[PDB]
């Protein structure tokens, strides 16, 4: 199930009991605009930045 979700705190969760990647659970900033790679790398843009 790749239906990933972002919580208000920024904790990536396929349905709660969150997702694990390169260590423990992954966390992203609150301003997600997340894009996920062709090989998993997760990049984020704060929605009002260059």
């Amino acid at each position: 199930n790749g239906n990933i979700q972002v919580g208000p705190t920024g904790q990536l969760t396929i349905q709660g009991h969150p997702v694990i990647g390169e260590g423990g659970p992954i966390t992203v900033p609150e301003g997600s605009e997340i894009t996920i790679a062709a090989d998993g790398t997760i990049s984020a843009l704060n929605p009002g930045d260059p």
């Binding site: 605009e33 894009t35 790679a37 062709a38 090989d39 790398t41 990049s43 843009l45």
Partner: protein, 260 residues
């Protein structure tokens, strides 16, 4: 309904506004001092789906990601304030302008408008009015026994009294300049009013401080290029043609989806 149909609707509306502007230009040939108007367009939102940056691999970059975009929102109409082609009317009350500058006129409500139209008239009380009694600024009152009027290149308006062997000077006719002629807001009657965009008005006699010169016996024609308007009209009709074609295509797509 479909992302396609809203986009095509915006395109049709843009072509319709463009045709409105062309029709207003084409109708206002042979109107003195009219300024050709032209619409400047502007594309709407772009729904970003994949960020054009956003490195895909640990090394790659994903150039030029997926973004769709909508709409053709018309953003402005610029007015071309170029000198019209003067015409020899040989009329003693018709005065044209060569260069920047606008006649100032007192609206009956007490506010001042600006007109590039010297098709003047003299009413009961002797005032110079302009096709509607709009009394100019500053007031110029012809004496009731004056015979012939003249308006020098410098705006000095003087009349020939009866019996008096001299052109006594009656009034002074000055122009006004705006540091953005285009930003004036037209209110009809061949009149413009000051807005925030035009900026403060600088009133001065003709010639001095950037204003033009005044030519009696001439009238300024509309700077509407007939061939330009005609080719614009052909091009607009074909663009409308094509956008309605896109609307119909989306309709066929949707209908085939329905009978599914």
């Amino acid at each position: 309904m479909i992302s396609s149909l809203w986009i095509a609707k915006t395109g049709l509306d843009a072509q319709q506004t463009n045709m409105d502007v062309i029709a207003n230009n084409l109708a206002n040939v042979s109107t003195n001092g009219f300024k050709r108007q032209r619409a400047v367009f502007e594309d709407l939102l772009y729904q970003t789906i994949r960020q054009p940056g956003a490195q895909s691999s640990e090394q790659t970059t994903l150039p030029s990601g997926l973004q769709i975009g909508t709409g053709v929102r018309p953003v402005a109409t610029e007015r071309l304030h170029s000198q019209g082609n003067l015409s020899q009317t040989n009329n003693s009350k018709d005065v044209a302008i060569k260069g920047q500058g606008f006649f100032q006129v007192m609206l009956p409500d007490g506010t001042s408008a600006y007109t590039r139209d010297g098709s003047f008239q003299v009413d009961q009380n002797g005032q110079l009015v302009t096709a509607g009694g709009f009394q100019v600024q500053p007031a110029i009152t012809i004496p009731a026994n004056a015979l012939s009027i003249t308006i020098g290149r410098d705006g000095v308006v003087s009349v020939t009294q009866q019996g008096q062997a001299a052109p006594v000077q009656v009034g002074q006719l000055n122009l006004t300049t705006f540091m953005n002629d285009t930003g004036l807001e037209s209110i009809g009657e061949n009149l413009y009013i000051e807005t925030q965009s035009s900026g403060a008005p600088n009133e001065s006699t003709p010639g001095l401080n950037g204003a033009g010169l005044l030519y009696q016996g001439y009238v300024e024609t509309s700077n509407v290029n007939v061939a330009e308007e005609l080719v614009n009209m052909i091009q607009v009709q074909r663009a409308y043609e094509i956008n309605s074609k896109a609307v119909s295509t989306t309709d066929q797509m949707l209908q085939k989806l329905t009978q599914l």
